[PDB]
Amino acid sequence: PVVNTAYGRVRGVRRELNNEILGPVVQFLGVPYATPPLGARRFQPPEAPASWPGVRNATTLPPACPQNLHGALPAIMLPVWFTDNLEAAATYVQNQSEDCLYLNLYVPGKKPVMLFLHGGSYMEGTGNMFDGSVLAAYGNVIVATLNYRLGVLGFLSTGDQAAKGNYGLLDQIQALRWLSENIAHFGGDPERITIFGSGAGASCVNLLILSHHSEGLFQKAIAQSGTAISSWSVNYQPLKYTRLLAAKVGCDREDSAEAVECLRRKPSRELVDQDVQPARYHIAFGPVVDGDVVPDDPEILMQQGEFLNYDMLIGVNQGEGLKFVEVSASAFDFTVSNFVDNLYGYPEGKDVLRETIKFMYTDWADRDNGEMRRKTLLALFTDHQWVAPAVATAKLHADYQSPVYFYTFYHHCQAEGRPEWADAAHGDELPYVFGVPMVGATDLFPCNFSKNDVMLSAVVMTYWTNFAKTGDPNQPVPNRFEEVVWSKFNSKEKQYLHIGLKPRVRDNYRANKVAFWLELVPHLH
Amino acid sequence: PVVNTAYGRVRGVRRELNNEILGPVVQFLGVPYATPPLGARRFQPPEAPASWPGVRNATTLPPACPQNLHGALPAIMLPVWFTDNLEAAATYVQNQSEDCLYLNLYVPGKKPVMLFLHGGSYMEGTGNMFDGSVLAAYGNVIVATLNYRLGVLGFLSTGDQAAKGNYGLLDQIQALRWLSENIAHFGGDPERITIFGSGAGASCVNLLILSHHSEGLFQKAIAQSGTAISSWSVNYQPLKYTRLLAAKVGCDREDSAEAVECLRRKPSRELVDQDVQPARYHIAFGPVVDGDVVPDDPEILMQQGEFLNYDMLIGVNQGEGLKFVEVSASAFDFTVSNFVDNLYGYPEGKDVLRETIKFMYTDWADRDNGEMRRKTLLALFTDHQWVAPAVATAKLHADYQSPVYFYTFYHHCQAEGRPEWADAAHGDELPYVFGVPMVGATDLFPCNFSKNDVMLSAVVMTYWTNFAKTGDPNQPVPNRFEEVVWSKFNSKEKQYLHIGLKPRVRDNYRANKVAFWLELVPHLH
């Protein structure tokens, strides 16, 4: 397994898969895409790599650039299986170094590419823990789980010229180019790149469409559970926090542009161990508006239809926010005051909105019971963050002559604390799209797989692969049900599809709550 | 059929009923109860009558004191069958005269009395058109349909001393005394008087409980479709209007007390032909707060529990207000602005309430169709007037150790413009309690009676008669269903009973809308 690219010649490996169904998976763990930053051009955009003679021995898990899984990280943005089994995930990124600009591959003539921008809160994660070879061989596609500058030294900007456009986004654009101008040797199609991701890694899958440098690189998108217009998708206070890690290591010279030229020699391990604690439901180090890759906010920029006709696929796990409440008449009256204070932009005229919300999410038919409160509160954080910025992105993107789809996941692998009372909960969609049941349970996903779960993987890896093939999720190839047609989303009818437990194509998901959060509350302020 | 009372000796008559079921009905049309006002003591309280020797020939329809059925009367307060077939009703009160202080009776030892205070808008009506002999003989009770000072010279007050406590209420209290101290000769029980009425004649059935002069007279009540705390139950601007009929006949001397002493000689026929047009949904001549019979408003007076333990029975015809709309996105946006302006007490801070109402009474699942609007508007006038001042009277009267019942009528005799799209509509409960089907259709009620309707009369004249017997509607004696127990109303559960088309004892009528109108909107102002 040896191939050659314009940059040189690289080797590979091949493995035998666990399940009896699947066959010849080839792997190319660790191939590069750009020159690694070293300390001179840190806090700086990337450049192409060098060239080598002979053969490059590249088959290992490459180092993942520095993170810290014991850092009092936010517990809302991160998924469940990442939080609970943290001891298993922590034993997976052990070797870390400033040099992380590599990318894995999985080769099963012009096959589609499925670049996976791993999720998280922009603080940790890696493609090493999302080793999808089952997904690589089932649908007969090429996966690529890269690594990019994430964390402190990942997405810099300050307001001055010393920290220009966010180096992470254009960092993974450097890889979008590499995959676009070197993939013919690997058997891929440079005209069918389909970025996809989850969590807050899908927030930066919309952000790439509205920019400019993305023109000739990719053609489609997939947005699992994220959106560019939520309350933790973009950073809006770079300067206040960028001068607060410098207040514990020391660069806060009152001269504005006197922080890069002392930190740029600071070692990477001390610079990623600061308690930059963001405001509630806000982030600290994410993509920022500067002008070259984020000209104008997606609030405005999305209205003027300068984005081309790609085909976004939005989705929402039904029930997620299980870490918002985990029952009285003054306990349910206590979350719904600090919640409103924390996440409303802080205008004046609040005293009406709290009571309107408190009236709308009550069930007056049976008020008394304690399973209304602590169960509608889980329906008040699922709606304001994941459920109704999504339809706003669906409408305005469907109007401008473009196809936008939808879905709503429901069914999870049953484990501890996961009854039907406990639905997806920001996760439990990832194992199924990754094929964890179909080859036996792995380490980080402990559950009790059955033959009921394994049928879901077939359909959810046929959709997400036929998609990359042609955008419609069904045309090439066809559980408990079958053949249901994948219905679109248009402003008039708003048909979601319910890829849950029995795939019925229902309509108009939560009309009352979506309309309350989207078309009534803007008037109150 | 000749009897004697403490005032003298009176004759009677007896008739044979149309239906084969019923038998010996006796009647005493026209017996007096008080001295008729003549022109000296007009605008003045009543007094006892004289005494006569021999026998008084009293069997005719007595004159009904002056009204005017062609006077551009309000079309919301009045029932339907009274408005449509106005030509039939107008041929029924032909002979009118200042002298109207008489009362009918119907004798079928200490039998209960069922004094009926006829409805309307306090401008017209009479007991002559509600001749209930079927109701008199079926349940074996005594009816009494009196006449009282109604209209212009009926409920006077000005703010000065020239017009003291409302002469109509204490006028029908004079009859409440007469029936309480002369009924032993007629076979009635002076300790079981049960006032009942409908329309805005049931508004002045609550008003008598909260007063004082009602102590030893009656013991129960029935409130069909009315309440003392609605927007047309009491007059709150006597002076502005009492000086406006005097501006077309002439008494508006700028001296305050210079209107009684010129009008008191004016003939009754000119004084009842003035266009005193009230404000929308308000009235002009109704009971007013002065101090002796209405000490304090039922807004306050009902809170302090000075009213004794009677047993009110509230009720609401499901669907009524069919003369509120009789479909666009700016037609439904046009009623819900002037409606809010007209009927809100005119404070500042309106611009939020209109939009909140417009959001709550929409059906976002299917917005487009034209049978949402012009059908939820009929559900916006039924709720703010008849449906949710009623439950407020039920709760606060059930708390103070008293029994309060409830019901919700649904089924009507089918006629023109009366499908199941068109429910009760402020009326169609009166024929059934009056027995119009059971003896064949009368003049003023044209319909097509069937054997389906005639079973409803049995139950609705067993309830309203067992009630007067013992207050519980069921204990002595027991369609499409049977034996369903008459459930009470208490603050915790709010069980209505649905005496409609199939008597199922459901619970918590319109919790969302009742709670919206009763426990959310008071904060917005």
CA-CA distances (angstroms) from residue A493 to A487, B235, B327, B365? 11, 50, 21, 9
Specify which residues B103 forms β-bridges with.
Answer: B31, B146
- Per the listing, tokens 């000796």 go with B9
Residue A364: helix, strand or coil by DSSP?
helix
Tokens found for residue A135: 């997904």
How far does B224 lie from chain A, in Å, by closest CA?
Answer: 25
DSSP state of B152: G
- Best of B512, B516, B524, B525 to disrupt the A interface by mutation (most A CBs within 10 Å)? B512
CA distance A246 to A156: 14
Q: Which residues in chain B are contacts of A356 at CB distance < 8 A?
A: 356, 520
Helical ranges in A345-389 per DSSP H: 351-360, 381-382
Give me A192's structure tokens.
Answer: 């069918």
The alpha carbons of chain B give a radius of gyration, in whole angstroms, of 23
Which one of A354, A359, A518 would you mutate to disrupt binding with B, by most B Cβ within 10 Å of its Cβ? A359
* Token output for A220: 């489609």
Radius of gyration of chain A (CA): 23
Rounded to the nearest 5°, which phi and psi values hold at A382?
-70, -25
Both structure tokens of B237: 């601007």
**Residues B96/B128, Cβ–Cβ less than 8 Å:** no
The pair of three-digit structure tokens given for residue A465, joined into one six-digit string: 């692969």
What Cα–Cα distance (Å) separates residue A449 from each residue in A444, A445, B492? 14, 10, 47
Which residue of A lies nearest to B365 if distances are taken between CA atoms?
A511
Cβ–Cβ pairs < 8 A, chains A and B: 32
Q: Which parts of B392-450 are beta strand (E)? A: 408-409
Q: Three-state SS for A106?
A: strand
Q: What is the DSSP letter of B387?
A: I
- For residue B426, give how far its alpha carbon lies from the nearest alpha carbon of chain A (Å): 27
Q: How far apart, in whole angstroms, are the C-alpha atoms of residue A386 and residue A391? A: 10
State the nearest Cα–Cα gap between B520 and chain A, in angstroms.
7
Token duo for residue A28: 């190319």
**Is A523 in Cβ contact with B355 (below 8 Å)?**
yes
Q: Which two tokens stand for residue B480?
A: 């499409």
Q: State the smallest CA–CA distance between residue A9 and chain B in angstroms.
A: 60
Whether residues B359 and A511 touch (CB distance < 8 A) is answered with no
Give the whole-angstrom CA distance, residue B31 versus residue B56.
Answer: 9
Find out whether B179 and B191 touch, Cβ atoms under 8 Å: no
Tokens 């005293």, located at residue: A351
Tokens of A447: 């559950």
A365 close contact with B: CB closer than 8 A: yes
Cβ atoms within 10 Å, residue A124 = 22
Burial of residue A359, with CB atoms counted within 10 A of its CB: 0-12 exposed, 13-18 middle, 19 or more buried: middle
Query: C-alpha angle with apex A116: A112 to A119, nearest 5 degrees?
Result: 160
Q: Residue A432 belongs to what H/E stretch? A: helix A430-434
Q: What is the DSSP string of B106-128?
A: B----EEEEEEE--SSSSS--SG
Q: How far is CA B28 from CA B60, B118, B143, B184, in A?
A: 9, 18, 11, 15
Q: How many CB atoms lie within 10 A of CB B150?
A: 27
Residue owning tokens 């034993």:
A91
| CA–CA separation, B195 and B313 (whole Å) | 11
DSSP symbols for A300-321: HHTTTT-S-----BEEEESS--
- By C-alpha distance, which of B491, B483, B486 is closest to B514? B491
Q: Give SS3 for B169.
A: helix
Question: How does DSSP classify residue A170?
Answer: H
Three-state DSSP class for B10? Answer: strand
Q: Which of A365, A508, A516 sits opposite B365 (nearest CB)?
A: A508
Token pair for residue B451? 């054997």
Alpha carbons A325 and A327: distance in angstroms, whole number? 10
Technique behind the model: cryo-EM
- For A266-403, list the strands marked E by DSSP: 314-317
Tokens of B61: 């329809």
Measured CA to CA, the distance from residue B127 to residue B62 in angstroms comes to 10
Q: Which two tokens stand for residue A305?
A: 């239809």
Residue B376, CA atoms < 13 Å, CB-side half-sphere: 22
**DSSP reduced 3-state for B415:** coil
Any residues with CB less than 8 A from the CB of A283 and at least 6 apart, and which? A77, A121, A122, A200, A232, A235
Question: Residue A32: beta bridge partners?
Answer: A102
Q: Report the residue from B352, B364, B508 with minimal CB separation from A511.
A: B364
Give chain B positions within 8 Å (CB) of A388. none
B511 → closest Cβ in A365, A511, A519: A365
Cα–Cα nearest to B195, from B220, B177, B178: B220
CB-based contacts of A45, cutoff 8 Å, min separation 6: A164, A165, A167, A170, A171
Which residue type does A468 have? A
Best mutation target among A512, A516, A519, A524 (most B Cβ atoms within 10 Å) is A512
**Residue B350: its chain A contacts at CB < 8 A?**
none
Q: Classify B238 as helix, strand or coil.
A: helix
Q: Determine contact, residues A371/A280, Cβ cutoff 8 Å.
A: no
CB B179 within 8 A of CB B193: yes
Residue position matching structure tokens 């391990």: A269
User: Domains in chain B and their CATH numbers?
Assistant: 3-523 (3.40.50.1820)
Which residue, B40, B154, B165, is CA-closest to B100?
B154
d(CA B134, CA B461): 10
Integer Cα distance of B476 and B485 in angstroms: 13
The token pair that represents A484 in the structure block: 């249901």
Task: Work out the number of other CB atoms within 10 angstroms of the CB of residue B458.
Answer: 13
Q: Given phi > 0 = left and psi -120 to 50 = alpha, else beta, which region is B426?
A: left
Q: Flag whether residue A356 sits within 8 Å of chain B, measured between CB atoms.
A: yes
Q: Which amino acid is at B320?
A: E
Q: For chain A, how far is it from start to end, CA to CA, in angstroms? A: 63
Q: For residues B111 and A267, what is the distance between their CA atoms, to the nearest angstrom?
A: 103
Distance CA A376, CA A392 (A): 23
Torsion (CA) B478, B484, B486, B488 in degrees, nearest 10: 160
Q: Exposed, middle or buried, A57 (CB in 10 Å: 0-12/13-18/19+)?
A: exposed
How many helical (H) and strand (E) elements, i.e. helices and strands, does chain B have? 17, 13
State residue B106 phi and psi, 5-degree precision.
-150, 105
Among B352, B515, B524, beta carbon nearest to A364: B515
**d(Cα B206, Cα B217) in Å, to the nearest integer?**
14
CB A187 within 8 Å of CB A107: yes
Beta bridge partners of A223: A197, A314
The reported resolution of this PDB entry, expressed in Å, is 3.5
Question: CA dist A91 to A68, A88, A273, A434, A506, Å?
Answer: 12, 6, 18, 20, 43
CA diameter of chain B: 76
Give the torsion through C-alpha atoms of B224, B229, B234, B235, to 10 deg.
-150
Q: Give the minimum alpha-carbon distance from B508 to chain A in angstroms, rounded to a whole number.
A: 7
What are the structure tokens assigned to B34, written together? 């008080």
Phi, psi dihedrals of residue A321, rounded to the nearest 5°: 130, 10
Angstrom distance (rounded) from CA A413 to CA A445: 10
- Whether chain A has a CB inside 8 Å of the CB on B512: the answer is yes
What does the DSSP 8-state code read for residue B146? B
**DSSP label at residue B56:** B
Specify burial of residue B230 (Cβ count, 10 A radius: 0-12, 13-18, 19+): middle
CB crowding A143-177: b at 16 or more within 10 Å, else e: bbbbbbbbbbbbbbbbeeebbbbbbbbbbbbbbbb
- Whether residue A228 contacts residue A210, with contact meaning beta carbons closer than 8 Å, is answered with yes
Within 10 angstroms of residue A372's Cβ, the number of other Cβ atoms is 18
**Scanning the structure block, which residue is given the tokens 């996440």?**
A343
The structure tokens listed for A154 are 């990942």
Question: For tokens 């009176």, what's the residue?
Answer: B10
Q: Which residues pair with A13 in a beta bridge?
A: A27
Q: How many CB atoms lie within 10 A of CB B416?
A: 9
* H or E element, residue A16: strand A13-16
Tokens 């898990």, residue located = A61
Q: Is B312 helix (H, G, I), strand (E, B) or coil?
A: coil
Question: Long-range contacts for B345-352 (Cβ within 8 Å, ≥24 apart)?
Answer: B345/B525, B347/B525, B349/B524, B349/B525, B352/A352, B352/A523, B352/A524, B352/B524
Distance of alpha carbon B129 from alpha carbon B118, whole angstroms: 10
Evaluate whether B458 touches B481 at the Cβ level (below 8 Å).
no
